[PDB]
C-alpha cells in the first residue's frame, strides 16, 4: 500500500470582527505539520515565531518594511473589505429554525425532546419551562451541530415527572425571529 | 467576538494536492478548483452576489509548495503524525418514515487532509445523490469534512459511512438505521 510519510503546510489568514466591522484583528499563521511555526498578529504589529522553526521567517519578513506596511493595512484592505463583500449573505443571512417537541424513544419519568433544526445563524437559545417558569435543572443538550451546509440543529431534552394538566414549554429565541418560537407539551 | 473570515490554504506532499478556500463562522463560502481553476461556491446563491479571481489562488499554491519544501527540509524531513477522524452520522432533520431526509457523515478532527469516504446501503455502495465538501480548517489545525447522502427513510434499510484514513488501523464503518 501507500506508506510514504506526509509533509503538510498550512496557511491561515484570520480576520476577527468585534462589534460589526468596528474593531478588527488579523491573525496570519503558518503551520508546518500540526504545528504553528510563525504568525503575525495585527495587534502586535509584526511577525513572531511560535517555535524555533519559525524564527528565520519572523526575522526575515520583519526586515521588509514594504511588506509589514501592507500587512498592517490588511485589517482594512483585506479584512474589512471582504467583510463588506459578503455581508448580505453571511452576516445578515437568516433561516428560521424548525421546532418540534416529542417524547424520546428512551426514558417513572418522561424524557421530552425539543428538536430545533435547519437554523442559521448558529447562535441560538432554547430553554424549557414548566407552567410558565424556567426549568434550570433536568435539562440536557446535544450541543450546537454545524451541518456543514450553512445550517445548524440541536436537541435539547427535559427530564420530567408528568402530572395531568402540566404544560412543558420549549422556548426558542433566534435572530430569524423577533418574538420567541414556542412549542408546548400538554401532560 | 462576533465573526471570523478565514482564508485557509494548504499544500501536501507527496500527494501533491492543495486547497484554497474562505470560511465564515465555520462555514465554507467558497473554494477554488485546483484543476479547473474556477471559484466554486458552497451555495449557488453566493456566486450571484460576489466573485473571486480564482486564477489567483494557484499563485499562492506555488508559493505554498516552495515553503513546504523549505519547512520539510529544515525540520529534518519530519513527517506529519497521522491523527484519525472521529466519525459521526446524523440526519439533516428529525427522521420520519418515507419523509425525505439526508444522511450527513461528519468526519472530523483528523489529518493529513486525505480521506476515502463511501456510503453503504445494506452492504452495498451508494452513488446517486451523494455530495461532499472540501477540507475545512479547525483551530487545532486538524480538519473537518462532510459527505452527504439523500435518502427515503425506511425500517428495512441499514446505512454505513465507510471512512478510510492512514490514522485508522482499519476502515471505520458507521452504522445508521431507522430507530424511531
Amino acid at each position: 500500500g501507500d506508506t510514504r510519510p506526509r509533509f503538510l503546510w498550512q496557511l491561515k489568514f484570520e480576520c476577527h470582527f468585534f462589534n460589526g466591522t468596528e474593531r478588527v484583528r488579523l491573525l496570519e499563521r503558518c503551520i508546518y505539520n500540526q504545528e504553528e511555526s510563525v504568525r503575525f498578529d495585527s495587534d502586535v504589529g509584526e511577525y513572531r515565531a511560535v517555535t524555533e522553526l519559525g524564527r528565520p521567517d519572523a526575522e526575515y519578513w520583519n526586515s521588509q518594511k514594504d511588506l509589514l506596511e501592507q500587512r498592517r493595512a490588511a485589517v482594512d484592505t483585506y479584512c474589512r473589505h471582504n467583510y463588506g463583500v459578503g455581508e448580505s449573505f453571511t452576516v445578515q443571512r437568516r433561516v428560521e429554525p424548525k421546532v418540534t417537541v416529542y417524547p424520546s424513544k428512551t426514558q417513572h419519568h418522561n424524557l421530552l425532546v425539543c428538536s430545533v433544526s435547519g437554523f442559521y445563524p448558529g447562535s441560538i437559545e432554547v430553554r424549557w419551562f414548566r407552567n410558565g417558569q424556567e426549568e434550570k435543572a433536568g435539562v440536557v443538550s446535544t450541543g450546537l451541530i454545524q451541518n456543514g451546509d450553512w445550517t445548524f440543529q440541536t436537541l435539547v431534552m427535559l427530564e420530567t415527572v408528568p402530572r395531568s394538566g402540566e404544560v412543558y414549554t420549549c422556548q426558542v429565541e433566534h435572530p430569524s425571529v423577533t418574538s420567541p418560537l414556542t412549542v408546548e407539551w400538554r401532560a | 467576538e462576533e465573526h471570523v473570515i478565514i482564508q485557509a490554504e494548504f499544500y501536501l506532499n507527496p500527494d501533491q494536492s492543495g486547497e484554497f478556500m474562505f470560511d465564515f463562522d465555520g462555514d465554507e463560502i467558497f473554494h477554488v478548483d485546483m484543476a479547473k481553476k474556477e471559484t466554486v461556491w458552497r451555495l449557488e446563491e453566493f456566486g450571484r452576489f460576489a466573485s473571486f479571481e480564482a486564477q489567483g489562488a494557484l499563485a499562492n499554491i506555488a508559493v505554498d509548495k516552495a515553503n513546504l519544501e523549505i519547512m520539510t527540509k529544515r525540520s529534518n524531513y519530519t513527517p506529519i503524525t497521522n491523527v484519525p477522524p472521529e466519525v459521526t452520522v446524523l440526519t439533516n432533520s428529525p427522521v420520519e418514515l418515507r419523509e425525505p431526509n439526508v444522511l450527513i457523515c461528519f468526519i472530523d478532527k483528523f489529518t493529513p487532509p486525505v480521506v476515502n469516504v463511501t456510503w453503504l446501503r445494506n452492504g452495498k455502495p451508494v452513488t446517486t445523490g451523494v455530495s461532499e465538501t472540501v477540507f475545512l480548517p479547525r483551530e487545532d489545525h486538524l480538519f473537518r469534512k462532510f459527505h452527504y447522502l439523500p435518502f427515503l427513510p425506511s425500517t428495512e434499510d441499514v446505512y454505513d459511512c465507510r471512512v478510510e484514513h492512514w490514522g485508522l488501523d482499519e476502515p471505520l464503518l458507521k452504522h445508521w438505521e431507522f430507530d424511531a
Binding site: 528565520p56 511588506l67 483585506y78 473589505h81 | 467558497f30 473571486f52 479571481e53
Partner: peptide, 13 residues
C-alpha cells in the same frame, strides 16, 4: 463585490 486574497510570503532561504 469582489473577494480579495492575501498573498503568500516566501520563507527565509
Amino acid at each position: 463585490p469582489k473577494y480579495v486574497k492575501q498573498n503568500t510570503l516566501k520563507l527565509a532561504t
